[PDB]
Every structure is written in structure tokens, then in C-alpha cells.
Amino acid sequence: GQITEGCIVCNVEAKPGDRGTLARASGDYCIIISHNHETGRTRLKLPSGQKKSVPSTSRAMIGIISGGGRIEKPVLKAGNSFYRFRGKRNCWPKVRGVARNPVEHPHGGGNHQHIGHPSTVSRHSPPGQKVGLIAARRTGRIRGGKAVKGAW
Amino acid sequence: GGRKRPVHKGITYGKPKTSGVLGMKLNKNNQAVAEQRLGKRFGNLRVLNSYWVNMDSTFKWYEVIAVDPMCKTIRRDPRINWIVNSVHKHREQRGLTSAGRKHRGLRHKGHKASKLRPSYRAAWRRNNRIVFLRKR
Amino acid sequence: PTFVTMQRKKRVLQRRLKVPPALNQFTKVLDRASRNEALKLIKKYAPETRKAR
Amino acid sequence: PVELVLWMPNLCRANKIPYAIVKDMARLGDAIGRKTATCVALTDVNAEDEATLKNLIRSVNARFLSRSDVIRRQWGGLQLSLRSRAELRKKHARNAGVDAAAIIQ
RNA sequence: AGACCUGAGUGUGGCAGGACUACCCGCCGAACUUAAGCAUAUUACUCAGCGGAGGAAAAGAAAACAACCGUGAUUCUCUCAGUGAGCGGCGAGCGAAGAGGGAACGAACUCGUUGCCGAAUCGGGUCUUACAAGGCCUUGAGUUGUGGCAC
RNA sequence: CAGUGUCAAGUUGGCAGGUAUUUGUCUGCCAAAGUUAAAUACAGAGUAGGAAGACCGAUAGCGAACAAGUAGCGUGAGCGA
RNA sequence: CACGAGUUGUUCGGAAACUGAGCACAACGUUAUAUCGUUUUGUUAGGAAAGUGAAGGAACUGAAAAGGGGCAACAGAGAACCUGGGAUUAUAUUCCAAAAAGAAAUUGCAUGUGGG
RNA sequence: GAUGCAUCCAAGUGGUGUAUAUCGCAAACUGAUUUCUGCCCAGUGCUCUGAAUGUCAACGUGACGAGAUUCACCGACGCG
RNA sequence: AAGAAGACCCUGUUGAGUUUGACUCCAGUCUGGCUCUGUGCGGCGACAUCUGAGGGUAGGGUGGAAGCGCAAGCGCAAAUGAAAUACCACCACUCGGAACGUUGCUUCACUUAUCGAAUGAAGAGACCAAUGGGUUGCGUAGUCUUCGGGCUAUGCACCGUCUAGGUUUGGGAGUCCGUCCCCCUGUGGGUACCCAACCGUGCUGUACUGAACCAACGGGAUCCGGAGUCUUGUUUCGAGACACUGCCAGAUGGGGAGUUUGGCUG
RNA sequence: UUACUCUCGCGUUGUUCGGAGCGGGGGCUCAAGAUUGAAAAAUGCAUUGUGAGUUCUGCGUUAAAGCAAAAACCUGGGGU
RNA sequence: AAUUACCGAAUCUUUGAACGCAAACGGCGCAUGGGAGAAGCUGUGUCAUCCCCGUGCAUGCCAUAUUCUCAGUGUCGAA
RNA sequence: GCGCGGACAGUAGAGCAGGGGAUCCCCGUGCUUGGCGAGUCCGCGCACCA
Numbered sequence A: 001g002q003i004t005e006g007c008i009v010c011n012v013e014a015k016p017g018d019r020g021t022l023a024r025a026s027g028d029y030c031i032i033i034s035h036n037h038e039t040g041r042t043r044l045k046l047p048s049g050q051k052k053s054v055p056s057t058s059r060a061m062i063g064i065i066s067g068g069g070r071i072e073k074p075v076l077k078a079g080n081s082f083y084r085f086r087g088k089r090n091c092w093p094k095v096r097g098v099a100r101n102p103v104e105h106p107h108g109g110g111n112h113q114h115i116g117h118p119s120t121v122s123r124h125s126p127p128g129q130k131v132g133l134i135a136a137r138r139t140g141r142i143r144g145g146k147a148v149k150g151a152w
Numbered sequence B: 001g002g003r004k005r006p007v008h009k010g011i012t013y014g015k016p017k018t019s020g021v022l023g024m025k026l027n028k029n030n031q032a033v034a035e036q037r038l039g040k041r042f043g044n045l046r047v048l049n050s051y052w053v054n055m056d057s058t059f060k061w062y063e064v065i066a067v068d069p070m071c072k073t074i075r076r077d078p079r080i081n082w083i084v085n086s087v088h089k090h091r092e093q094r095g096l097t098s099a100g101r102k103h104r105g106l107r108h109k110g111h112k113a114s115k116l117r118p119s120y121r122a123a124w125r126r127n128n129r130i131v132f133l134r135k136r
Numbered sequence C: 001p002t003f004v005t006m007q008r009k010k011r012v013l014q015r016r017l018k019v020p021p022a023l024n025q026f027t028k029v030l031d032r033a034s035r036n037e038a039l040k041l042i043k044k045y046a047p048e049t050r051k052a053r
Numbered sequence D: 001p002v003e004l005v006l007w008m009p010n011l012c013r014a015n016k017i018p019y020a021i022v023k024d025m026a027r028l029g030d031a032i033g034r035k036t037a038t039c040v041a042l043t044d045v046n047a048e049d050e051a052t053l054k055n056l057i058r059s060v061n062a063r064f065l066s067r068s069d070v071i072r073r074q075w076g077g078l079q080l081s082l083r084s085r086a087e088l089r090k091k092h093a094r095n096a097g098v099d100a101a102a103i104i105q
Numbered sequence E: 001a002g003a004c005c006u007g008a009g010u011g012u013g014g015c016a017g018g019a020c021u022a023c024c025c026g027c028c029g030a031a032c033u034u035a036a037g038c039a040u041a042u043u044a045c046u047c048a049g050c051g052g053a054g055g056a057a058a059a060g061a062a063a064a065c066a067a068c069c070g071u072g073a074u075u076c077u078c079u080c081a082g083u084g085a086g087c088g089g090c091g092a093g094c095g096a097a098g099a100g101g102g103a104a105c106g107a108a109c110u111c112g113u114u115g116c117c118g119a120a121u122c123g124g125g126u127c128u129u130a131c132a133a134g135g136c137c138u139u140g141a142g143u144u145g146u147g148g149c150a151c
Numbered sequence F: 001c002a003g004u005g006u007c008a009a010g011u012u013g014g015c016a017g018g019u020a021u022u023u024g025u026c027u028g029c030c031a032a033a034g035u036u037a038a039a040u041a042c043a044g045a046g047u048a049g050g051a052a053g054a055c056c057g058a059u060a061g062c063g064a065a066c067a068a069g070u071a072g073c074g075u076g077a078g079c080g081a
Numbered sequence G: 001c002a003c004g005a006g007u008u009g010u011u012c013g014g015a016a017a018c019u020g021a022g023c024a025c026a027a028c029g030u031u032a033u034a035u036c037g038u039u040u041u042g043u044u045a046g047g048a049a050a051g052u053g054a055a056g057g058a059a060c061u062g063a064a065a066a067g068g069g070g071c072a073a074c075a076g077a078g079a080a081c082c083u084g085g086g087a088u089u090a091u092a093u094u095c096c097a098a099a100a101a102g103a104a105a106u107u108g109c110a111u112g113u114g115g116g
Numbered sequence H: 001g002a003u004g005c006a007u008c009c010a011a012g013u014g015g016u017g018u019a020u021a022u023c024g025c026a027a028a029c030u031g032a033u034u035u036c037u038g039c040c041c042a043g044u045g046c047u048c049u050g051a052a053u054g055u056c057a058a059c060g061u062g063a064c065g066a067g068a069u070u071c072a073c074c075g076a077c078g079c080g
Numbered sequence I: 001a002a003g004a005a006g007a008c009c010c011u012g013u014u015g016a017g018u019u020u021g022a023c024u025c026c027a028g029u030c031u032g033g034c035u036c037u038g039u040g041c042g043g044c045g046a047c048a049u050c051u052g053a054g055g056g057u058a059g060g061g062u063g064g065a066a067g068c069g070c071a072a073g074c075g076c077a078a079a080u081g082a083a084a085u086a087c088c089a090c091c092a093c094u095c096g097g098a099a100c101g102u103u104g105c106u107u108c109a110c111u112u113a114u115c116g117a118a119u120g121a122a123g124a125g126a127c128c129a130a131u132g133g134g135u136u137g138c139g140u141a142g143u144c145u146u147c148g149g150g151c152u153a154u155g156c157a158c159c160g161u162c163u164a165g166g167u168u169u170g171g172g173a174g175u176c177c178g179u180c181c182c183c184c185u186g187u188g189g190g191u192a193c194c195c196a197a198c199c200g201u202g203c204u205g206u207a208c209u210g211a212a213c214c215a216a217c218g219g220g221a222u223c224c225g226g227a228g229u230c231u232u233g234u235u236u237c238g239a240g241a242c243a244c245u246g247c248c249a250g251a252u253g254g255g256g257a258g259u260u261u262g263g264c265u266g
Numbered sequence J: 001u002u003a004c005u006c007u008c009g010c011g012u013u014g015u016u017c018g019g020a021g022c023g024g025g026g027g028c029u030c031a032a033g034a035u036u037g038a039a040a041a042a043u044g045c046a047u048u049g050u051g052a053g054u055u056c057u058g059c060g061u062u063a064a065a066g067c068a069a070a071a072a073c074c075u076g077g078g079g080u
Numbered sequence K: 001a002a003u004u005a006c007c008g009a010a011u012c013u014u015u016g017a018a019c020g021c022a023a024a025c026g027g028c029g030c031a032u033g034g035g036a037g038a039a040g041c042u043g044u045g046u047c048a049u050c051c052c053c054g055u056g057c058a059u060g061c062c063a064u065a066u067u068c069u070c071a072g073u074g075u076c077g078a079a
Numbered sequence L: 001g002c003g004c005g006g007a008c009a010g011u012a013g014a015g016c017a018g019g020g021g022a023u024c025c026c027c028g029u030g031c032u033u034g035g036c037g038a039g040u041c042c043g044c045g046c047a048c049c050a
């Protein structure tokens, strides 16, 4: 509430006392859209493009998160991906589901590598069946305006 | 609530008759369960009885009555010193309190309880064992 | 400690809810002076102790 | 538990026995020389205290026996904290005359 | 000041965990198998699993049977009875009870309530040759009720 | 019998009386605290004593008539002469 | 195979006595069942888990200090000794005897000399 | 966009990606550059519609009946 | 020739792995209801009761009552119909209102259940004052009384009270002005304010690496304030009686389980 | 310290450095080594110079990779 | 009686439910009783550090305190 | 098997195949049985023990 509209902020508290949960990845920030002095709420634009309102008591850091521009440099090498994920978690390399056998994946098997059924699966699919394009509203190459992702 | 069958990932095996996970009910009542938890936790006491006091949507509260079998007041009382004798150790674990008798079917007598007296196993034993008379 | 918080919150919750008359009547005590006088009269006529009996 | 004596004022009222609800079962226990006491009944006193007993009966009846309709009718509780009452006060003060122009006169 | 009443600390006195587990008591709980297949059924309220006690356990003094000229706590035996009971893809299969002859049997008691009392109760010290079912003392516990008496 | 919901009556009363219901008769009994010996079990138990057998007779009979749950095997659970 | 021997430490390695990936006693919760779960992202547990520096008239009393007790490295951290021996059948930076072959370092207590 | 998505667990004030926060995380497909990636939404999926103007569950509501019950009405996702 | 009870092929009322839009199901997901679950204001309806107010072609019934009604009209007689109206009495179905009780949904305002975060539960709110609280008061007007005093409105009072800073109303008293020493000069030490009002809300700092703890100081007989006080009490913040707990119900559901997938046959 | 006035200077094998103080003179300090002696000849066996290897040590690029922690110990800042 | 048999008295190492804390450690503590004890002191006693032995010390629960010590914006209440 | 909507809108009109004059108007054309209850075909969504 003490920050002028149009100011660029990062490390934004979703709830007062959160100690910062929004706009923390390198290069990311929020934009303050407006204040509602009656309700005591501030409306802001998140990096994803969604607009969210939080109590005006939530704290923000002035500026943008450092380290921006990282994803612009091609990795070029499997070894560079290896070192990138070394400090994160065991999630790489990635084996395609159609390269697996039907015992361990719905996409497995066949005498050609193929998904034999539509890869868009329901939101209600149980774990083990919910693989592929999960509850996709649309598929294929996005033409024209990219719609803001996430829920409504 | 009802008992959830503790199978991995809710998966059962064998005949479809045994495939239920969420709809089975524990064959003991909750009062007997509360008495058993009290008795297991404090093995130096003798559980005597219990009664309902309150319940929530999540919880049920039962007050359990327990006796210290080493207290001289208990040991010299002809009304309660029966429980000092070691045959009454953990009687709630064996379904011997009022709640245990209730879920054993022992509130009934005669033709409503013939297959469960003096116990289900006792009646099964005397109904299913092959008798070989000496001269037959 | 948990019990301190619980007794305080119990007083709060007893005040915040709608107390039916059968329970509410016990907050409508006798006045101070009559209470002292009645307590003194009862103290006059207390039972015998163990040794007096 | 309050259920031990929750019925006692009603039983006293039904039999037309003067009763008082007083503070602190521990003070009652102090009177009879005990730790606590739920209730005490006076059956008779000597002549030196007949007048005191009668005056006590009168004031006790004023508070309790004569007020049976109110006592039977009166719901309690519904009390706000100090912070809530002050907040309602401040709100009524802020919106003290917002609708003054809506009035025809 | 202090009280009680809710909860802690320490001292003192004690108890539980483990083992056994044939039989017994409480839960939990299959599948092979049989149905000439198989899913209900069957195997089986069994095995495996988790708890608990004893010298036996459990049961047990009618909210019982009967429908009689009536019986009379429990348990067990023969029998009722593989049943002109019943259950059952009414298939495979399953499946008791009362009465009757018997074993046992000194088998009966307690509380709570009611109503008449109301600390007469308990524990602890200490005397009696005595951690007395005794005397004395004792606020310690108990009147938010222990103990007596009665159908 | 169990979970959950819902929940009495008061002996002008309840429960039972093996085809659901509503009536009105009859009969038996009085649930929702508790203790209790014997007659029964010991279907892979123990302690101290006993008695036997139309049983087996060292590849049999317990795995074990013997320094046998031993020697040996297995990472181990166990296996086991 | 039989008989009889052989491994010597203030300092070497470990432990007393560190933290790591981790483990899981307590506590609490769950489960018909604890033989289940949580238990280092500063950190147990609705959670009152600290028991003694001081003083003050020899052991009795008590301030402030937030987040219980352990374990997990014989290659990480750490750790005061090293040469000579004609000293063995076999041990040795471990044994050697007042000329300790000898030379050191380092703990813990005590005794003196001296202090400014 | 975190009272989230994916997701472990028989269960809990339980667990993982998350010591994170869209330049993040999770789920697929293709397989370096280069040059390109056409047409088809009928089918089956997936998705949305802030009509869901038909269809249902039990929960309710009413009526008939001495009552057990019978009928009627309401009834959400979803399907259409 | 040996090595292995053919692995090919068939048969069996033998399997197992895998698939699915096979049969029969189960977790998971979603959805409805009840529950958790409290307060107060309103809104739309429903129920009970008073009561409007009209009225297949047209001139709704259905009955007593063919005569009186102040007046004087309706026929048993004129007009119809798939039905012919009197004076007392006689309403179909809709529409309309309270004024009470209950309440099914629902808007809003709440806050104590509950949910979500944070924190070493580290400073909440008020004093700025009610549509507040109380015999641990005082009146008034009704209305009751067990005669002691209540209840409902109404007012007065008590609970109940202090502030950085900003702006302006009154007070003198020491010496900006100047003063009190030492060396025209230089330097060193201090005060140059208090009260009251409105605002404000608990406020001594600001608009590329410092130090800060175990107060001094001032009063009263060691306490006190310095360092305000208070508590119808919630650690604080955000939601909030829904979205979270249990039960019941429907759909979905190869993610998973079980099982089946005839026979004859050159 | 007119050091850098229009070719600044110093220095590495090597990627530098300097008015935020180069270079020269004179000093302070740390780390590696030297040299002298005590040990020590009383021991050991039957000698004092150079060149090549050798990582103790000194010199304090890949990275969307930036390369543990604690005990113990050390010193100061405050106070006695 | 190194006989046997039986049984009342005794002994009974390290562990193990194992329970002061640990553990591929014959490890390490706190409290409390003891033992031994060099150098100094008048052979004797005494004895710091070190060393040895006994006892108690897990968690929970019950009872209890000749009436122990406390906590709570729980409820009261002093005179 | 149960319920719905429909045999274009209905309480017999509308769309429009074929008709006169200059795309306009006008002729035509059109689910059963009973005094508003009981059957036939399409679909939908739902039930499935000979």
C-alpha cells in the first residue's frame, strides 16, 4: 500500500508475513496495477501474466530479481544439462514414454513407437493414467495470441 | 467412521467378494476399542468399565474406569478385590467388559444367541469336530 | 502452557455463545452483602468436626 | 459438572423453598469447614437467628424466588469482546452521517 | 494474605513392558481347493497376521424355554439330526434349537437405584507379642458421597 | 454384530413368543454394572511323579537309540545330516 | 600334523571428544494391531523437557541463557615422539635402566623461587 | 499463482517435486544445425456453455392407506 | 549315437505377462445431501389464520331459501347452456395485503467453530468512548411482584485515562538578547520555557559496510518512574460459518483386481 | 610524489598494474627456505659441489558446475 | 567321604524385557558410600590429581507427602 | 421395462411443391381410439437374476 502504482517489485508476499513467495526466479518481477484504499487490497500483475489481489499490508522488495537473461544461452551439451541438474534433483535425462514398455507406461509398446490413443487425458484420471497432456483445453501449434495459462 | 481396509494402494486380491476397501466395518465397537487403548497404554491398571460422554463429527469420547490392583483399599474391599486376581489382567483385551460382551453378541440368550455361546469358537468347536465313540 | 490457554479460551467461548436460561441463571448470583450474611449464618451452624462428634 | 445442581433451582421453585445462587463453592466449603460444597440447606436455627433467617429469606426471595418468570425466560451470552465492541463503535462513527442526504426533510 | 481447582516438579512406596502360547479369549483374515469351466457359494467365520489370560479359559443366575399335567443359572455327553427344520447359481453343498436320558451341583452372591440414616468409611502414624477386619490420634482422602440397614 | 444418521418408553411400561403391517388378546421374562466351584479342552505347551501298548525295531520309529537342532550349508530369513 | 611358544604404547589407530549424507529414542499423532509416521529448510513435542556461575549467613540455596537425548567418518575434522640399539626363534616410533643409548613434547594436580 | 498443479501413504496437525515460486515446478511429444512443417474438428479423445429449458441418486416435500407401502413433486455433476 | 519328459504344431473345460470401446468389480477424481455449524439485519417464497376482489360457445359452481327486503328485483315464467341469477345465504382459480409463529432457500454485516499462513506465539485493541458492561448506583414512564424488588424504554452517572509531533490560546523568570570564568580576542560551560485547545495516533532515526547489552538520572521509605494505563480475556495476520470432518448417494474410472474368450473340423 | 607529457612507467612464461598512489630511497611485517650453534659422537657404516625428476610449498580456466560442516582453539570490542 | 539321593541356608561372571548414557567401544557419566594411595608431615598415620569397588539414577502409570515446592489476564476472596 | 420430447405451430393456422397478372400478392396444401383418459413409429437419458 506504500508503493506507487506502476512500480516494479519482486519478493512479493502473497500473505502479510509470508516473507516473500511471488516473483523470485531470476529476472522476474511483479507490476503494481492499483490500490483499493477501502478494501485495503492491492492488485498486481504476476510474471505468468495473471492479475492477483493481495492485502495492502503485504510487503514487496523494490526492483527485479537479479540473474535475468539466463535461459537465453543455449546449453549445447548433455554434460551442461548434467551439471545444471546436479544441484537440483534427480530428474534428468528424460526417457520418452513411447520408448518404454507397456508394463511401466500407458504409452509403452507397439511394433512402432506410437501413442495408440489420444494423449489428452481427463482431469479426473487416476495417478498412473494421468500422463500425456493433462486436461488440455487445446493442443497443436499456438497461432496468434498466447492465452494466459493457468486457472481462471 | 468406517474402517478402511489397510491394503496397499487399496488393491485386493482373490475373489471379488473380498475386494471392498471403504465399506467394511470393524467387528468391534468403538467403546471396546477405547477400553483396549486405555488398557494397553497403562498395564499397571485394571480396566473395569466405560461410558459415553460426548462426540464430535470426528471424535468420540469414552471415560474408562480403572482400578489399581496394588492399592490396599482395593485389596481389602470384598466388593472390588475380585479384580486383583490375575485372571482379570487385561480383561478388556479379551472382550470381557460390557462393551466386549456387547459386540460378542452376549446381550442375547436362547434362540437369538445359540451359535455364539459360550463363544463363536466354542460353538464352532462342538458343532464341527468329528466324534469317534469307542463302540460305534 | 496449553492448559492456561484452554481455560482462558473456555471463558471466552462461554461468553460468546447463546447461553440458555437454565445455565444462564447461574451467572445471576446473590449480592455481596446478602452472600456474606448467609455465609456467616451457615458458619454459625456448621457440622461437628470428627473430634467434636 | 454443572449437571449436579443445574436442576436444583427448579426443584426449589417447585416446592416453594427459598434459594440463593452464590459465588464460589469453595467459600461454601469454607463455611462448613470443608474444601468445597455444592449446596447447603438450613433446616432450623435458634431463636437468636430467626430474625436474621427471615431477613435473609426476604432478600434471597427478591433476587431469586419472586423473579421466576424472568429467570425462566432469560437467555444469556451473545457478548462481544472489547476489540469487537470498539470496532463497531468506530465503524458507526465513521459512517455517522453517510445517508443524511437520503432523507427527504 | 489466603482458598479451591485445573495442571506441573521432586521425594517416598509400588506396578507394566519380556518369556510361554498345546488348549482358551478378542480382533484380523486368505488362497489352493470343490462346483468336472466360473464370478455367488465352497474351502472357512479355517491357515497365515495382531493382541490377552489361566490351570483351564470362556460361560453363568433368565428382558430363558415353551404353549405343556408344564420346565427353570452356566458348561458338557448321548440324542434331537445330515434333519419330510431351514440356507443354497434351491447347484455343488451347507445346517442348528427346544424337549428326553445323563455328568456336575451344599450354588449362589455384589453394586447402582429406591428409602431410612449420614463419615458410622478409607489411608497414615502409633499402642496392644499385632504394616490386627482392634483401640488412640490424624485434614490427609472423602459430603461432586464412603459406609450401614431393609425388602 | 459394526459404522453413520436418527433416537424411546416407563411397569395405564418394556423385551421375547422363527412371514412384513395395523389392531387386541394371551404367555414368559425384566436388557442396557459386576463376581462365581464343578462337570468340558489341552488338535506340535510346560513342572513333579506314575501306568501301559495285538505299535516301530537302526534306510524303521521323532530330524535326533550316538558330544543332534549337533557337524555342515546360506549375506539372511532359514536349511539340516 | 604334534608339542611348546609369540602380539609390550602418556605421544601410533580407535574411544574418551567433532560435524556429514543419514538414523530414530523420547514426545506426540495414527493404527483392531506399533513391529507405523513425523523427527536439520535452526532443529522434538499444544510445547511448563534448562537443576546450576554467583552470592549470602562447607555444601545448602538461586539470576540469564528459546528450540529434549543419542548415534552415524579406523581415508573428512582432530591427534603431545623420534632417532640409535650387538634388541627376539617370533613384537617393536610399543622393548632398552641411572651414563635409562638417549634426546624431547604434552596433560592433571601439588611444592618452592621470584614478582610489581 | 500455493487453501495450487503433479503426487506418496492403511491412517494422522503425515509425505515428495518444494531450502522452491512461472527465467519455477510437474506431464507429454519430437530429436543438432539448415530449410520447412500443407489440407481435415465428420469420428474418438480432451476442453468450455455464466442455457445446461430432456434424463437421473438419495436427501427432502406433499397426497392415498389402519399401516407396511404406493404415487406425485424436487433433485447435482455427468450424458444429451 | 550323447546331451533336454520338442521351445514348433495340436489338445486340456491348465497357466502367466500384456491390451481393450470383453464380463464382473475396486481405489482415485468429481458431484449432491446431511453433519461439522454460531450471531444479528434484510429478501423471496411455503405453511396456518383474517380476509380481498373479480369472474365449447356464451347468456362456473353447489345447494337450502318463491318472497321479503329501507329501497324493490330476481321467477316457478323473457334471453343460454355440454349449466337460468332471487330477499338471508352460495363460491371455481388466480391476484392482492399484513401480524403475528416456523422456515425452506438466500443477500449483507459479524465472530466464537473451523480452515490457511507467520512467529523464539516480541509489543493486539482501547483510552480518540457506544446501537457497550455492571447490584461483586440514581432518577423518570409504564408493566409486574412472592412486597423483598424486578422487567421493558428512558436519561444522568461509574467502568474511563495518558501521549511524540503539527497548529494556536494564557503564565513570568531567570542569566534568544544576553550570561558565568579564564586569556581588545580566543576558548570553555549552560538556559533560551510552562500550561490550555483542535489535528494526529502511540509516532526520538532515513529519504558504497561504525558503536549501541548487564541503565544512568529523578522521587518515596528498598520500592517507585525512567520504560503511560487498561483487558466483556482471543499470540498475530487472512478467511469464516463456507470451505474442513464423518456418513449416505450418483457419475466417472485398464490406474488396478478377478475371470472368460464354445464345439465340429481329412 | 611535474608519476601520465602526447611514444607514461613497472613487471610476468602467462591473461597485468598505478593519483582509489606507479617507480626510486629508507623501513615494518608474514611465508618459505638459508646460516650458527645445542642435540652429536658418546651414534651410524666400512663428501662438497653441479645438472635432471619430484607438487611440501610459493605464486594468495568449464560453470545455467562457483566447488561441506562442527568441535576445539585464537584474537578483539565492552566490563571487572 | 571328591560316595550317592534329596532339600529348606548360600553363592550365582558379561548380557538379555534390560531400565544412568552408549555400543562391531569389555566405553563414558551424575549423586552418594567406601578402598588403595606417591611426595611433603610426626616407621606411622593424612592425602591432591589418577585408579578400583558398592549403591541409586529409563519411560509410563497408581498411591502418597505426619501435610513438600510451585504455575494459571481459571473461579473467588481478604482486612 | 421407466419416463420424456416429435409425428411446422396448434385451440386446424404456418412454411411451400403446382397455379394470373406485373421478387410482391392471390388458389391450395395439410399419428390413432374414447368423455380432456387409453395404443403406433423416431429419437434421448435411464432398468436389466428365468
Ligand SMILES: [K+]
Pocket (backbone or CB within 6 Å): E036
Ligand atoms: K477338475
Ligand SMILES: [K+]
Pocket (backbone or CB within 6 Å): none
Ligand atoms: K436333563
Ligand SMILES: [K+]
Pocket (backbone or CB within 6 Å): none
Ligand atoms: K538289525
Ligand SMILES: [Mg+2]
Pocket (backbone or CB within 6 Å): A099, A100
Ligand atoms: Mg524397447
Ligand SMILES: [Mg+2]
Pocket (backbone or CB within 6 Å): A102, A103, A105, A106
Ligand atoms: Mg498399460
Ligand SMILES: [Mg+2]
Pocket (backbone or CB within 6 Å): A098, A106, A107, A108, A109, A110, A113, A114, A115, A116
Ligand atoms: Mg504404444
Ligand SMILES: [Mg+2]
Pocket (backbone or CB within 6 Å): A113
Ligand atoms: Mg519415431
Ligand SMILES: [Mg+2]
Pocket (backbone or CB within 6 Å): A098, A113, A114, A115
Ligand atoms: Mg512416434
Ligand SMILES: [Mg+2]
Pocket (backbone or CB within 6 Å): E031
Ligand atoms: Mg479360494
Ligand SMILES: [Mg+2]
Pocket (backbone or CB within 6 Å): E033
Ligand atoms: Mg487342500
Ligand SMILES: [Mg+2]
Pocket (backbone or CB within 6 Å): none
Ligand atoms: Mg480354473
Ligand SMILES: [Mg+2]
Pocket (backbone or CB within 6 Å): none
Ligand atoms: Mg492364526
Ligand SMILES: [Mg+2]
Pocket (backbone or CB within 6 Å): E057, E058
Ligand atoms: Mg472360568
Ligand SMILES: [Mg+2]
Pocket (backbone or CB within 6 Å): none
Ligand atoms: Mg468374570
Ligand SMILES: [Mg+2]
Pocket (backbone or CB within 6 Å): F058
Ligand atoms: Mg544306520
Ligand SMILES: [Mg+2]
Pocket (backbone or CB within 6 Å): none
Ligand atoms: Mg533314523
